[PDB]
Amino acid sequence: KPQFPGASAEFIDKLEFIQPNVISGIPIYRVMDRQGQIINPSEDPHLPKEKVLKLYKSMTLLNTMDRILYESQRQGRISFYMTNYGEEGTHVGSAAALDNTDLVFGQAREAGVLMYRDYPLELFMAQCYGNISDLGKGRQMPVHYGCKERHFVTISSPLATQIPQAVGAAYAAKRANANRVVICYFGEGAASEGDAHAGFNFAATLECPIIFFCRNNGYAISTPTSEQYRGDGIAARGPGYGIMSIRVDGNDVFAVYNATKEARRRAVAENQPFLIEAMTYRIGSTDHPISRLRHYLLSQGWWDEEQEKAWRKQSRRKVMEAFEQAERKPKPNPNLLFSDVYQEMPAQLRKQQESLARHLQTYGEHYPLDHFDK
Amino acid sequence: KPQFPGASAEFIDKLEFIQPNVISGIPIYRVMDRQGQIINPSEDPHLPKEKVLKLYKSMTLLNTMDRILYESQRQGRISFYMTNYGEEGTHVGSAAALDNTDLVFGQAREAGVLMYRDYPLELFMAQCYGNISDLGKGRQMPVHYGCKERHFVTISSPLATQIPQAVGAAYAAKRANANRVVICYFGEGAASEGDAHAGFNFAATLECPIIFFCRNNGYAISTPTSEQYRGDGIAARGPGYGIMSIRVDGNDVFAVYNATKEARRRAVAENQPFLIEAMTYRIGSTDHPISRLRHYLLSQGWWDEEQEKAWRKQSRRKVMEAFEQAERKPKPNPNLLFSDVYQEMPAQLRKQQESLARHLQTYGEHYPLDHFDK
Amino acid sequence: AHFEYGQTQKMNLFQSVTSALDNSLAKDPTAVIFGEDVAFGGVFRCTVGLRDKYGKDRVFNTPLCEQGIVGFGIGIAVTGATAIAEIQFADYIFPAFDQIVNEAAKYRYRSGDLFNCGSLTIRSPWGCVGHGALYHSQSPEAFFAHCPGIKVVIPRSPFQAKGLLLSCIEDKNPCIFFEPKILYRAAAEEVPIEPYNIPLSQAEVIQEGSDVTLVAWGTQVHVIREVASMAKEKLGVSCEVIDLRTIIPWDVDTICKSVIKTGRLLISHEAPLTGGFASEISSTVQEECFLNLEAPISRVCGYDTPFPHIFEPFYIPDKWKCYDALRKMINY
Amino acid sequence: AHFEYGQTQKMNLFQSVTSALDNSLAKDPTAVIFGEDVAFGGVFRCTVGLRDKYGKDRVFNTPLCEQGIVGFGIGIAVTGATAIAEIQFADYIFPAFDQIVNEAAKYRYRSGDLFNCGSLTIRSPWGCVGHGALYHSQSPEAFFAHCPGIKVVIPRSPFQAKGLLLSCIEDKNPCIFFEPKILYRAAAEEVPIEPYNIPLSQAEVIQEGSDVTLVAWGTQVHVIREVASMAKEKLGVSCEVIDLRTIIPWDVDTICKSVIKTGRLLISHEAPLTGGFASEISSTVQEECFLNLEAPISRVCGYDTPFPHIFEPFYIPDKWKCYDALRKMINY
Numbered sequence A, B: 001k002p003q004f005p006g007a008s009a010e011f012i013d014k015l016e017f018i019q020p021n022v023i024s025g026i027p028i029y030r031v032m033d034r035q036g037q038i039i040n041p042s043e044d045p046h047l048p049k050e051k052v053l054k055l056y057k058s059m060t061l062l063n064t065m066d067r068i069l070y071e072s073q074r075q076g077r078i079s080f081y082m083t084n085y086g087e088e089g090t091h092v093g094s095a096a097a098l099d100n101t102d103l104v105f106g107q108a109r110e111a112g113v114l115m116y117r118d119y120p121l122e123l124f125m126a127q128c129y130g131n132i133s134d135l136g137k138g139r140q141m142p143v144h145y146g147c148k149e150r151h152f153v154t155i156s157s158p159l160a161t162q163i164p165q166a167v168g169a170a171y172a173a174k175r176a177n178a179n180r181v182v183i184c185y186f187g188e189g190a191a192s193e194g195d196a197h198a199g200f201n202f203a204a205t206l207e208c209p210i211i212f213f214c215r216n217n218g219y220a221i222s223t224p225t226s227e228q229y230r231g232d233g234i235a236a237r238g239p240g241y242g243i244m245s246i247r248v249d250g251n252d253v254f255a256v257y258n259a260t261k262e263a264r265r266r267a268v269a270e271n272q273p274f275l276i277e278a279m280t281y282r283i284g285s286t287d288h289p290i291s292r293l294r295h296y297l298l299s300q301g302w303w304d305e306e307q308e309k310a311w312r313k314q315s316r317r318k319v320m321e322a323f324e325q326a327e328r329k330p331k332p333n334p335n336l337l338f339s340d341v342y343q344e345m346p347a348q349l350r351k352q353q354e355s356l357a358r359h360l361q362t363y364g365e366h367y368p369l370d371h372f373d374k
Numbered sequence C, D: 001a002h003f004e005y006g007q008t009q010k011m012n013l014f015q016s017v018t019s020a021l022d023n024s025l026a027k028d029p030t031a032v033i034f035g036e037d038v039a040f041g042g043v044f045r046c047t048v049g050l051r052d053k054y055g056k057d058r059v060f061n062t063p064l065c066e067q068g069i070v071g072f073g074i075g076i077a078v079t080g081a082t083a084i085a086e087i088q089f090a091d092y093i094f095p096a097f098d099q100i101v102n103e104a105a106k107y108r109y110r111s112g113d114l115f116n117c118g119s120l121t122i123r124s125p126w127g128c129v130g131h132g133a134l135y136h137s138q139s140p141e142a143f144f145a146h147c148p149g150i151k152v153v154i155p156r157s158p159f160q161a162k163g164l165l166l167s168c169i170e171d172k173n174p175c176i177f178f179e180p181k182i183l184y185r186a187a188a189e190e191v192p193i194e195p196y197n198i199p200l201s202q203a204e205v206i207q208e209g210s211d212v213t214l215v216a217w218g219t220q221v222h223v224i225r226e227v228a229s230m231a232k233e234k235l236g237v238s239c240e241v242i243d244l245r246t247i248i249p250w251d252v253d254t255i256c257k258s259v260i261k262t263g264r265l266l267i268s269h270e271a272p273l274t275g276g277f278a279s280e281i282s283s284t285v286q287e288e289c290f291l292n293l294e295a296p297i298s299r300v301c302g303y304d305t306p307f308p309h310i311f312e313p314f315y316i317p318d319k320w321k322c323y324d325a326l327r328k329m330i331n332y
Ligand SMILES: Cc1ncc(C[n+]2csc(CCOP(=O)(O)OP(=O)(O)O)c2C)c(N)n1
Pocket: A108, A109, A157, A158, A159, A186, A187, A188, A189, A190, A191, A215, A217, A219, A220, A221, A282, D036, D064, D066, D088, D092
């Protein structure tokens, strides 16, 4: 009956405002309860033992590394750190549901994705210390990871900027007939940025194979969600952009996995975006997913206290071997502050490089040159 | 059962993505049919004759002025114009539902709001000609209206920038115990800007008495809505921000009025935002609302062909008296390009003013100084 | 109005842009063009015919969101594909300023060259147009000049535009190419049909001279060419006229070699004086050519105001303003 | 580390900002303070205690959206109420660049003074901090200096910050006040408890001298003070040390009067050289003081790169870099 181009709808002859459903919001998908028990057998992904142990060892190794690097920051050995506490299940559950070559754009707290993708401890450490092994050349703040080999786009501090970028990478993957998805992580505070509205709408109108993965931990620094939004979290925004959406228990590695696995399958087949909002508890900058999964392992009889003790020792040893190496490497040559600004250093930038080199020849005693290379 | 701070919801034990309802979207509120007949008597606002004739004379006078100024632009007498065709009902129906002192932030095509608020024809013309009567001092492109007396904030070309501004003005009105609303108009294309996401969310979280009025005419320049969004237009986005929302037939002056009147009453009482999406047809830059309302008048027996002929003549005469005056006024003194950059011209800006005055003393024959004041 | 590469045809500046874009999408299968209203050919006709020729997946409209356009384009370029984004007027590039300055410009540096967005070009109409007022007249190059990691390029003519645009598209760094919109339908000139390149970061001396150097870019090059002619005729003064072409990284050597010869410099641009890019050229030339300067370096620029509607003839640094400044400089 | 108004107390720079804001909300019932995480006192503690003292309706958190913060603040100011917006780091001001440049700066002009947003102040932490890397170290003042209609103000100390911030809050034009974050907890000094004002667009000569003028702002004023001391001790050179304080509109007269006296000028800032605000000061001083210049004007600035993490000690224009440039200038 109505013939308006902008919407498909009927007429109504009574004035009725549409009310938001916030008190009974989109429900939270769960697979296992706090005791590690599977709630609905048809939902159990029945992942094989070696894969479930990789989920558990990746989360716990991330937690072991966090404790060490958090102490390193408290001592001033690195300038900044921020732990992954409470986000291990979201990080690791979702990464396990991706293909190895699916491209990841992160938000902040993605180290578990790299851990699941077997990023070396040496390289997490090198970035935090800015040493010569950092392929980032020591230029970014600690806990700004990136890896071209593992398809994990370097993180940047500005919130939400990666959201429309991830959409562009997904459009390019669609054209390349990649059969690849892109995943983009962001927090519930970052979802208030204008770039999130841009990315969500572009992905839907340009039909992009992308998973938007929002971690809702209830806070953005000091700001609770009551001051961040008044709708039913982020998942209720997806349908307004035409995006299929789900909310999951972020402390349940299997719920995260199942939702990400199904979003990936459908995003890649259908070239459409999916939104997952994973609810967690912000536990930690400078009812837990690990406990729940441990309870599960200890059911299938897949783990026990002896194995837990041995792995806790082995993981600490590996973390400390990497920490030692990282601290004893030099920092990169100060000439590296000038390269990669453009692909080729402009002659005027080379002139500034040369002026620093002359400066250090005369005044070098005044600079902390002892553990810089060359 | 779930205890997550970010959302109020139950658990669900089956994986189910939430699908958007786009094919059967939010219905379009209507009060009168294309023949001017009231469809549901309980919805008729039974506005008095003098007010309904003011609605009709405001829309038709706007249409008369548009035809004249559009021809003026085609002849190069003004540099730009853009008509209000198809938007007369939305402009005028909503303005009639506001209090005279409610503050308006516009989007582009708001001239009917000023017309309903009795903005002089001389002043619409003065802004388009940039003459000495323009209180804008000739500085903006034509069809950038503003009036402090009539609480209509000057329009600016950048789309959507007024949306978060209108929210701030509404927060300030709430603190002032104004018992005033703010209305903010924008198109469906402008709603894709990041500033719209900012304004919608801020209004809800800061509890602001604001009406967001989106005109959805199916196109943003050449871009149809299929390339602008994939959800159910703009009205379906409101509930995701916690905003009460409605969709109305923009060709029905009474549906627009009823929805704006009720949004105003509730926004001012409750300090909460309301969203109205008015669906229209983009009819015209350099099934119609007037026809429907004429059919209604001609029912109550409130108008007839004699009155229509007399008003068409009278309105043309008034428009042409103002057009003549506007064309024969000079432009403002070129010194006015320097004032109001800051409240007080900085001394270095005064130096530039003085340098133009010296320049014109020597080289003035080269400048089109004949119809500039002083 | 205030102002050897194979077969050529006469093209105006919009046509030359379409020719560059056509040549690019023919030879680079990854390339895509997108922005507001580009599918039907654009509001200045720069993309006419391209969607029909190359396909809807390669020339397409986005939603109306500049920050989204640039972020999206960065993401395409992260995968290695050529991304040619359009911003409808340069005045509307500012919603994307964070994506340009904090993201595109820093992408390669901050990742140690693990990722980049070199295959991004942003093109946008620029400069005054007679009646564009505050938001259809701006010339924002000085805001971008202070951001290491992007290139900013502005042509003066159809032949220059096609060669500089193809160089931006193929340059391995994110580039902003500002197209002077008042030239889009102005005089045509002969432009090669097949691709060719004009180097970035290279100024062009378009007229040799010995008494004073004049530097400008975009449409203002035609103004200073006319000023050179007035100075020759009225004052017997020989002017060397230079089109800067690339704002950053700019050709310091060509400008300084000219000023060492002439001893005088006048730089002119439509953008406002304070913080404008003439400030960088002047302060650099002073440092490198101090002993050669016979008179202070002159900047003849737009006033430090927003860009007005009715007052545009009085606002712009036209040939009389430039000529009067030049006369004072010669007489210093 | 690289570097008569009634009762006073020792305050560091964060405390002096809280004191300005407290004095403002006491004397102006319209005033409100808002931004990310301001309610609990802010990430740099600048708003501690204010919400408890003045109420949740007057000191409150927004959603995480900088473009929204600035647009919202403009709207408050359109109604005449004082709006004190916080941007958490100056590096994150760029999402709001369009609201600042296209809207706040042009609001009064484009309406013929029918509307304005003069009662807006945006305050933001600024400058390097030892380890802030690309996004917690920036000094964006040159991007704003090219936008007529806003004022940009940067203090060098606690006493200066409170007096300049109260002047911005009360100035009838939209103001950006950049607070050097490396000074927030550095040395205290005596700051009056009650309100007082320091004028905008006024530089301060903090040490008279006769051989060379040094100009800087923010923390870099302390670097050039030290350089003056090195030059006096090592070279017997007398330096006049000037804090610019207001970037725009800037105090041209004080700087030129100094250079006419000394004949030499060195300007220093942490921001990158190209397009930095030293370019505007240098090119203006050259024009006004040409005949007095004994040596080229020197700019000692950050390199034209993003701001690095591990390399910060080598990037910044520290006292050795400034001193070496000064020595060359004296010997020119
Ligand atoms: C554009 C921008 N503004 C502000 C910040 C400072 N900031 C860093 S984290 C943070 C809170 C982010 O909250 P959320 O997105 O919920 O992420 P979470 O820390 O909870 O994972 C803020 C405001 C920033 N990095 N970028």
